Every structure is written in C-alpha cells, then in structure tokens.
Ligand SMILES: CC(C)c1ccccc1NC(=O)Nc1ccc(S(N)(=O)=O)cc1
C-alpha cells in the first residue's frame with residue numbers, strides 16, 4: 001500500500017514508488033571517520049536560533065515534527081559548507097525500539113539510539129516547496145542521541161507527546177527553544193545527500209555533528225509510546241522509523257575538524 005517502516009512497506013520496498021531510492025546521492029550513509037577528510041576551506045558553521053518561533057507539534061504517522069514560523073528571517077543556519085542562508089522550518093527525530101538502534105547515519109557502523117534532524121531551506125528559493133526541487137535546496141543538521149543523562153531542553157517535547165499519540169494529531173507548541181537540544185561542540189561531517197524518507201529527493205546538504213547529546217532512558221521510552229496508526233485503528237508503536245545506511249557511491253564526506 002503506502003510507504004512505511006514495516007515488512008511489506010519498508011525501506012527495501014520504497015524504490016518501487018520512488019525509483020530515486022537507488023540514486024546517486026541517497027541518505028543516510030555510514031560515516032567512515034578514517035576516510036573522511038579534513039577540509040580547512042570549510043568556513044565556520046553559524047546556528048542562529050535566538051529568534052526561533054515554534055508553532056505546533058504534529059504526529060504525521062512517520063515521526064513527530066516541531067514546526068516553526070518560517071515567514072520571516074529568524075532562525076537561520078549558514079556558514080560551514082553552505083552558500084547563503086537557510087531557514088529553520090521543522091525538527092523531528094528517528095529512533096529505535098531498543099537503545100542499540102535508531103539513528104539513520106552511523107559512525108564507523110555504530111548506531112546511536114536516535115537522531116535529531118533540524119530541517120532548513122535555502123532562502124534563495126522563496127519557500128520550502130520550491131527549495132526541495134533544487135540540489136542545494138535544504139540543509140539538515142543531524143545530531144545523534146545516546147542514552148545516559150537526561151537532556152533538560154528536550155523535556156517540554158516529551159511531555160506533550162501524550163496529546164499527539166496517533167497519526168494526524170497536532171497540538172499547539174509555542175516558545176520552544178531548540179538551542180536546548182544542541183551539544184557543546186559544532187564539529188561536523190558534511191556530504192551531499194537526500195531526504196531519508198519518501199519522496200527521497202536529492203536536495204539536502206547534510207551536516208552531521210560529531211558530538212552526541214545525552215537523553216535519559218525515560219525520555220526515549222516516551223518516544224516509543226507514540227503510534228504510527230490513527231485513532232480508532234489497531235495500535236502499532238512508532239519505533240524503528242529509521243532508514244538504514246545507503247551506498248556512498250561517488251561522494252566524499254568532509255570533516256570540519258582534525
Ligand atoms: C514534497 C515533500 C518534500 C514535502 C512537501 C511539503 C511538506 C512536507 C514534505 N515532506 C517532507 O518535508 N519530508 C521530509 C522532510 C525531512 C526529511 S529528513 N529525515 O531527511 O530530514 C525527510 C522527509
């Protein structure tokens with residue numbers, strides 16, 4: 001039927017509806033830390049979220065998105081590998097049914113418990129819908145999660161999940177500050193890739209931070225209480241909503257650090 005993460009509609013099936021699944025710049029990928037090369041030409045990364053304005057949180061049946069008002073020039077990502085300015089539109093996570101899996105990118109084949117994606121669009125293309133049609137349309141900032149100490153800045157997200165348990169439910173979610181989800185270091189790897197779910201468009205500059213954030217077991221357990229299904233349908237837990245690593249093909253991963 002329609003795509004998902006199950007046996008009959010998961011990642012190995014996506015290529016039938018979305019042939020670009022077998023394309024030349026698909027994501028995620030395994031980051032081989034020894035083959036990644038330091039690029040002194042990379043300019044410093046600039047994350048300016050002081051004026052970010054969150055509006056709403058939505059369970060879309062695949063993950064949950066915290067959405068931002070992107071009608072003004074507020075929360076922007078620039079520098080690093082990027083030319084120009086990219087505006088924050090939403091963030092979401094991918095996670096596992098177990099602490100030992102959940103991330104989409106891997107690091108020397110290591111899977112983290114989850115992965116946060118902060119999605120930004122290139123303002124030269126006017127809006128998100130036009131930007132995703134361009135090879136440099138999006139920049140996604142990826143941040144690994146490991147299970148250990150709690151992330152206090154995540155808790156406001158965790159506590160609203162009960163109100164969006166099932167597909168299609170949304171809730172007001174204003175004044176959430178995504179700066180509370182960032183690690184200390186902005187050291188990163190970068191490569192050209194794609195959306196990691198259908199339609200799998202090859203429009204993303206990936207920027208994946210080397211330093212993970214820690215969240216508590218209790219925090220990620222609450223992610224795993226969400227549902228893929230809609231209300232009044234059979235309960236299917238929203239877990240393992242990650243795509244495995246795709247072939248690197250003719251790409252090089254660059255590091256911002258040595
Ligand atoms: C046509 C698609 C791109 C579209 C138009 C309007 C609203 C939402 C969407 N879909 C998405 O935004 N999908 C989407 C966004 C981000 C990602 S990810 N996991 O690579 O960061 C994967 C899928």
Ligand SMILES: [Zn+2]
Nearest residue numbers: 093094117196
């Ligand atoms: Zn994602």
